[PDB]
Amino acid sequence: SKRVLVVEDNPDDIALIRRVLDRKDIHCQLEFVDNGAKALYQVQQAKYDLIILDIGLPIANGFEVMSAVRKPGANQHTPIVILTDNVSDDRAKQCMAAGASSVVDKSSNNVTDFYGRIYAIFSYWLTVNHCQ
């Protein structure tokens, strides 16, 4: 059973993410935490198949989370997807420098696009990308 860790605090985003997985029959353990401190603790506790984070949360301590995950250890090479509203090219480029696997615009002002991007992230990283 795959496990995913998502650093996100918007409760409608969260509810939409759970629902996408449901409908699309994507079966994994999902864990949400609302900040970077909590993230850095959970990465020490379990090996994840995927870690998603909203770099828009100052409180997510995104770059710090990414450095720490990228260190020697169980999740050293766990895919990290940044999923954040309004990604600029600069910020995407900064995430990529800090170790992100992928940067994705939520486009959450367009639920149709937001929904299909959630499904693409989980679909790709869990059923296409090779998992141990």
Side-chain angles (χ1 to χ4, degrees):
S1 202
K2 312 326 169 61
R3 36 209 21 235
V4 179
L5 174 71
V6 179
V7 178
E8 178 50 62
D9 76 347
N10 185 313
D12 303 306
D13 296 11
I14 293 159
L16 177 68
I17 298 165
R18 320 197 169 258
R19 266 162 204 148
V20 177
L21 285 53
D22 243 74
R23 294 177 171 252
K24 302 289 192 168
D25 242 300
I26 297 176
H27 290 290
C28 67
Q29 312 283 68
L30 207 53
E31 295 161 18
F32 301 82
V33 302
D34 69 8
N35 74 34
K38 312 173 147 160
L40 289 153
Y41 178 83
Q42 277 315 115
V43 301
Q44 297 306 324
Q45 307 304 321
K47 159 69 178 111
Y48 291 94
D49 300 277
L50 174 61
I51 295 159
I52 300 161
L53 73 99
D54 174 26
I55 205 57
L57 265 188
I59 328 94
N61 307 155
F63 299 104
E64 314 65 59
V65 172
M66 287 180 254
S67 321
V69 177
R70 289 283 180 252
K71 280 178 161 41
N75 297 278
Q76 184 176 14
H77 304 133
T78 291
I80 295 164
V81 173
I82 303 311
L83 176 68
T84 198
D85 250 301
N86 264 320
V87 338
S88 60
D89 291 349
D90 286 359
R91 193 79 172 174
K93 199 154 153 159
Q94 292 191 296
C95 299
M96 296 306 294
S101 307
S102 172
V103 176
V104 182
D105 206 313
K106 267 175 171 172
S107 268
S108 54
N109 62 335
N110 179 341
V111 68
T112 300
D113 279 357
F114 189 13
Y115 185 103
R117 282 166 202 263
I118 297 161
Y119 168 59
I121 289 161
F122 277 81
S123 184
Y124 183 80
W125 290 105
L126 303 185
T127 64
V128 178
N129 188 69
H130 176 272
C131 297
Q132 84 163 156

